[PDB]
Structure 1
Amino acid sequence: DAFAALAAPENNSNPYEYMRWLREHDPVHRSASGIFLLSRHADIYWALKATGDTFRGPSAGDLARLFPRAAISRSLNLLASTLAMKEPPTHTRLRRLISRDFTVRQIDSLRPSIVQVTQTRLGNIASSLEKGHVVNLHEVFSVVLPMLIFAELFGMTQADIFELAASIRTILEGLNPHASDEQLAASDAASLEVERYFEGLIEKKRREPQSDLVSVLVSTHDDDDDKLSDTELISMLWGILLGGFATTAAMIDHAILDMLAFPEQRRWLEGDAASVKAFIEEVLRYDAPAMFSSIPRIAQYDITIGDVTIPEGADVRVLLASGNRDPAAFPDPDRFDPSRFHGTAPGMSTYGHVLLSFGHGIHFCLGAQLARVQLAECLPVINARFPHLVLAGDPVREPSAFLRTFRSLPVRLD
């Protein structure tokens, strides 16, 4: 069972050796649960692009058949009504309600806050590091920047997002096939607390609307529940919150760790916009924040791939991280090399193969530009501010079945 392999402590630090074995010996892998896992870049790309007809989100019947605990799991039923589980026209309706605030144009208008938050945070980080303290950069920068920026966009107070960060982490870990009974229970319970917060937040924004995404969603719902039902509203709030910062923080963590691990590639962070972006794309390819997606893709046909046949109705997952290191798509895949993404469109290598960390197709990440811009603003500043930064020991990873997140990124000045 590949999902238990990826969650095993042995493979927590570097799971790519197992992923390499999986691509070569079982690329269309059937787990013990009957869930399939695609590890080759070309198959992952096809599955993502084919979502719509060949693959769809689960119906009511699929949900009961594949997730028998669904009637009992608050987290699973909240997921079932997010737009990531839907196809057009429903998917098109939901996405258009939220896409404006994530466009290039609107993300640009956040750059002053990103700079301000970055400079304010670093000024305090510098003060502590010049005394010779050790700083958990994950805790005091990597999570803080996207939490604050997301809260501003979404309509949450900074106090709210910090109060809920622990609930978010707990919810996220229950969203994978290897989740233990305890993790699933804890996830459902935290989803309840998050849902109660949003009930309070909805009434506040109903009575006090601002230029934030939650206010737009609530007014849309209040005006016409066929544009956004009560079920779709609460799943959207819960879902966007889940996706709003945890993976961005992990990207920042990975970027800092790559900065310190490969001093030769650090020069890319000192160049023009294109050179900085190229570094960030290679961070995303080299170690995706989500190894695979919690989102099920249900086969609408028997799908024969080589000698393996995926039966109709089967849940299929995509190992984004493995496709990112597939030598058929990225030569010398274990080399960290920003030149792959220099001068090209975002996510596209100079040889025409895409990174997969943001997905592809109808469910391509809504927040990709928001994530990329935050790191493009702060990473060159970190690099210039602290040239003598080093690790003060091994980073402590958040043990996860599928997310590549950290509990600590301990640094100090040399």
Structure 2
Amino acid sequence: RDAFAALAAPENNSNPYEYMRWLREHDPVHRSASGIFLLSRHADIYWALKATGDTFRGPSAGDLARLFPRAAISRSLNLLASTLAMKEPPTHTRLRRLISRDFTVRQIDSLRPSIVQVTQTRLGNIASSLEKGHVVNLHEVFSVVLPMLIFAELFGMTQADIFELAASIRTILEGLNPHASDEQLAASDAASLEVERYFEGLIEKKRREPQSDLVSVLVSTHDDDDDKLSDTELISMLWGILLGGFDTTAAMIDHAILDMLAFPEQRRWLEGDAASVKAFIEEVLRYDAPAMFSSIPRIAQYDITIGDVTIPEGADVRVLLASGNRDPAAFPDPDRFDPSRFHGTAPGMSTYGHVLLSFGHGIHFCLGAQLARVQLAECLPVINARFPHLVLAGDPVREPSAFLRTFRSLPVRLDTSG
């Protein structure tokens, strides 16, 4: 039984956590049919994430060629290979350093007003329909929209552009699936051309007429260090930033709305102070990792042993983040949605000192973790207040993803009771 196929099967597509429990206890260092390993326990996942750099290296040109055989020499794989997620130290260390110099907590906090503004407008667009007793696919009208509009504000782009780029991301990703046709490959390569041309023009525009967005800050001079991302590095950083926030953030919003509706007694957390709202959102992340797996390959630098299981040099190791979040050794009563686990603590850290894994750990820790958290911290209380009697209208329809717990629809309506 291949654990990657077992987790994509329809028998475990709705609730995969019983199978994950089985893995943790019976096959915690699972070797798949492809030879790729999958770690399901919190302890082994934590170790492997923090070892990335010493025990594990990033994917080589040969690794990516094996992982993407149909796109080995494509423009699209070359663009993905250039992203921070696919790099390793010390190159990864400079690039991370340079984007975090300007992609700061202050920068992100300055987006909170836009987050509320977008949420008010989008909810206002559907207020009448909900008031008339109708059903709304909240995923399509809100969850996918808010993250892209916030990216547009962040980068200094138009709404039209970000929605066109998202489509290009869709095409490129379809072009990199292992079963992708020649036609999808060609379509992907043209889109990659499109995306590179767009960012080159966006870079040049902000350089001559800088504004207050992140791209302007990134392309202008800095007082302290004269180091900066070259144009090629900039194109790749902005592309990878968008890829990192594509689907993931929308899924996190969907999951948070679904947790509000399934556990109405927990919506009190969204009505409290900042610390209270953050606690709810941390538990949303622990209860259902929007990203089930790691997509960053982690390659053994030598013959590794976890227990008596050998992971040979050059082997690819992935981690089941969602399973570690439900590991009772790290989170007691793991199947209970309880925001108190993270009330008053540092982000991602439980009151018992255990970290949730939804964002990773170590040197590839999600660059956008704060951006995602702030988007939910601002939009969720606004949703909860505007529609107190919001209820699930039907079963959400899950969207098949290799490693994300995405939704195609999240149908909601207002409770009709005289």
- Conservation of the 8 A alpha-carbon contact between 1:93 and 1:227: no
Query: SS of the counterpart of 2:226?
Result: coil
- For residues 48 and 186 of structure 1, do their structure 2 counterparts lie closer, same or farther at Cα, with a shift above 3 Å needed? farther
The alpha-carbon distance between structure 1 residues 134 and 108, as it changes in their structure 2 partners (threshold 3 A), is same
- Taking structure 1 as reference, are residues 62 and 409 closer, same or farther at Cα in structure 2, changes over 3 Å only? closer
CA contact (8 A) 1:134 1:411 kept: yes
The answer to which of 77-86 and 34-43 deviates more is: 77-86
Ranges in structure 2 where 5+ consecutive residues have no aligned partner: none
- The answer to whether the Cα contact below 8 Å between 2:169 and 2:243 also exists between their aligned partners in 1 is yes
SS in 1 for 2:413: strand
Match of 2:45, SS? helix
Identify which range, 297-306 or 137-146, moves more after superposition: 137-146
Q: Is the 8 A contact 1:302 1:311 kept in 2?
A: yes
Distance 1:78 1:182, change over 3 A: same
Give the drift of 1:95: 1.4
- Aligned-pair CA distance for 1:11: 2.1
State how far apart, in whole Å, the 1-side matches of 2:182 and 2:45 are.
29
In 1, distance between residues paired with 2:116 and 2:145? 13
Q: Secondary structure at the match of 1:407?
A: strand
**How far apart, in 2, do the equivalents of 1:57 and 1:190 lie?**
26
Deviation at 1:85?
Answer: 2.3
Distance apart, 1:107 and its partner CA: 1.8
Name which of structure 1's ranges 311-320 and 264-273 shifts more when overlaid on structure 2.
264-273
Q: Does the 8 A contact of 1:291 with 1:320 survive in 2?
A: yes
Q: Which moved more, 1:173-182 or 1:281-290?
A: 173-182
Moved more, 273-282 or 79-88: 79-88
When structure 1 is superposed on structure 2, of 378-387 and 91-100 the one drifting more is 91-100
Structure 1 stretch displaced more, 169-178 or 232-241: 169-178
Segments of 5+ residues of structure 1 without an aligned counterpart are none
Q: Deviations over 1:301-360 (max 9, x none)?
A: 111111211111111111111111111111111111111111111111111110001111
- More deviation, 212-221/94-103: 212-221
| TM-score of the two chains, using structure 2 as the length reference | 0.90
- Find the residue that maps to 2:222 and give its secondary structure: helix
3-state DSSP of counterpart to 1:42: helix
- CA RMSD across the alignment: 2.9
2:304/2:311 contact within 8 Å kept: yes
Check whether the contact 2:103–2:214 (CA below 8 A) recurs between aligned residues: no
Greater shift in the superposed pair: 79-88 or 248-257: 79-88
CA contact 2:293–2:321 (8 Å) conserved in 1 = yes
Distance 1:355 1:182, change over 3 A: farther
Give 1:195 shift.
3.4
Residue aligned with 1:88, SS = coil
Residue 178 (structure 1) shift? 8.6
Question: Structure 1 residues 70 and 311, CA, compared in 2 at 3 Å: closer, same or farther?
Answer: farther
After TM superposition, give the deviation of residue 105 of structure 1 in Å. Answer: 2.1
- The structure-2 alpha-carbon separation of the partners of 1:128 and 1:67, relative to structure 1 and needing over 3 Å to count, comes to closer
Deviation at 1:174, TM superposition (A): 6.4
Is the 8 Å Cα contact of residues 130 and 414 (structure 2) preserved in structure 1?
yes
2:280 aligned with 1:279, yes or no? yes
| Post-superposition offset of 1:166 | 3.1
Quote the offset at 1:35 in angstroms.
Answer: 1.2
Q: Is the 8 A contact 1:78 1:234 kept in 2?
A: no
Answer whether contact 2:68 2:178 (CA < 8 A) is retained.
Answer: no
Paired with 1:16 and 1:295, the residues of 2 have a C-alpha distance of 22
Report the Cα offset of residue 63 of structure 1.
Answer: 3.6
Range with bigger deviation, 120-129 or 280-289: 120-129
**Matches of 1:183 and 1:355, distance apart in 2:** 36
CA contact (8 A) 1:3 1:31 kept: yes
Question: Does the 8 Å CA contact 2:102/2:217 hold for their aligned counterparts?
Answer: no
Deviation of 1:220 after TM superposition, in Å, equals: 7.4
CA contact (8 A) 1:205 1:214 kept: yes
1:234 to partner: Cα distance: 3.0
Tell whether the 8 Å contact from 1:55 to 1:297 is kept in structure 2 after alignment: yes
Summarize deviations over 1:116-165 as a string: whole Å, max 9, x none.
22222222222221122211111111122221111111222111112232
C-alpha contact 1:41 1:329 (8 A) present in aligned 2: yes
Q: Which residue of 2 aligns with 1:246?
A: 247
Deviation at 1:181, TM superposition (A): 8.5
Show CA shifts across 1:179-203 (max 9, x none): 8988777655644443343344344
- Residues 396, 409 of structure 2: 8 Å contact kept: yes
* 2:296 alignment partner in structure 1: 295
Query: d(CA) in 2 for partners of 1:392 and 1:299?
Result: 47
Does the 8 Å CA contact 1:292/1:321 hold for their aligned counterparts?
Answer: yes
Q: Normalized against structure 1, the TM-score is what?
A: 0.91
Contact 2:64 2:72 in 1 (8 A): no
| CA positional deviation for 1:9 | 2.6
Question: Bigger shift: 197-206 or 107-116?
Answer: 197-206
Q: Post-superposition shift, 1:275? A: 1.4
Within 5 A, what are the aligned runs for 1:260-279?
Answer: 260-279=261-280
Cα distance, 1:227–1:270 mapped onto 2, change above 3 Å:
closer
8 Å Cα contact 1:221-1:228 kept in structure 2 = no
Residues 330, 354 of structure 2: 8 Å contact kept: yes
CA distance in 2, matches of 1:172, 1:98: 24
Aligned equivalent of 1:92: 93
Residue aligned with 1:72, SS: coil
**Cα pair distance change 1:239/1:249, threshold 3 Å:** same
Q: Residue 113 and residue 203 in structure 1: after superposition, are their counterparts in 2 closer, same or farther (change >3 A)?
A: same
* Segment of structure 1 superposing worse, 21-30 or 101-110: 101-110
Q: Deviations over 1:269-296 (max 9, x none)?
A: 1222211111100000011111012111
With 209-218 and 376-385 compared, the bigger mean Cα shift is at 209-218
Pick which of 286-295 and 160-169 moved more. Answer: 160-169
Q: Is the Cα–Cα contact under 8 Å of residues 281 and 377 in structure 2 kept in the other structure? A: yes
Helix, strand or coil at the partner of 1:29: strand
CA contact (8 A) 2:394 2:411 kept: yes
Question: Quick check: 1:101–1:153 contact (8 Å CA) kept in 2?
Answer: no
Of 223-232 and 42-51, the range deviating more from structure 2:
223-232
Q: Judging changes above 3 Å, is the alpha-carbon distance between structure 1 residues 232 and 167 closer, same or farther for their aligned structure 2 residues?
A: same
Between 1:279-288 and 1:122-131, the stretch displaced more is 122-131
Deviations 1:352-383 (A, max 9, x none): 11000111101111111111111111111211
Q: How many residues align?
A: 414
